[PDB]
Design a protein around this ligand. Structure first.
Ligand SMILES: Cc1cc(C(=O)N(C(C)C)C2CC2)no1
Length: 150
């Protein structure tokens, strides 16, 4: 009973979370997952400030109100070569990665590793945070509050 959560650097408190190496998070699960990191889904303004500090990914993820990809450099296979916060307009499907916002993180680029999941609750799952440098933090718990996300 295991969940892998790949996380990034934080930029103005904003970071990306990919679950189990595939698009697999619902919007309800995303809010709960960010809450386990004492975080919330970013607002569009928070995401734009993070972009300005150096944040970009090549993955769709929830923010408050939309699913987006922050882009700095144009790349044909990432958000159709767009720059800025690219907003997903048309999709059949509901599951993506998520972004999260932690207000207590440093104001600009923070590329230290994540070493805690501070607000998960009691449960049976081995949750492993996987940093980009491969370092891992694991703890037994749960973060999903909606049964249909389990
Ligand atoms: C202590 C401490 C802080 C971190 C860290 O990188 N975090 C990021 C994801 C905002 C916070 C939620 C735990 N890891 O350990």
């Amino acid at each position: 009973n295991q969940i892998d959560l790949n996380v990034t650097c934080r930029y103005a408190g904003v970071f990306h979370v990919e679950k189990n190496g595939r698009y697999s998070i619902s919007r309800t699960e995303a809010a709960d997952l960010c809450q386990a990191f004492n975080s919330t889904l970013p607002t569009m303004d928070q995401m734009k400030l993070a972009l300005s500090k150096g944040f970009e990914t090549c993955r769709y993820g929830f923010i408050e109100g939309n699913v987006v990809i922050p882009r700095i450099h144009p790349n044909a296979i990432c958000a159709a070569n767009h720059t800025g916060v690219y907003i997903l307009v048309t999709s059949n499907t509901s599951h993506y990665d998520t972004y999260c916002f932690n207000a207590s993180a440093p104001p600009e680029e923070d590329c230290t590793s994540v070493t805690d999941l501070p607000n998960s609750f009691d449960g049976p799952v081995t949750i492993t945070i996987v940093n980009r440098d491969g370092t891992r933090y694991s703890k037994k718990g749960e973060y999903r509050t909606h049964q249909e996300d389990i």
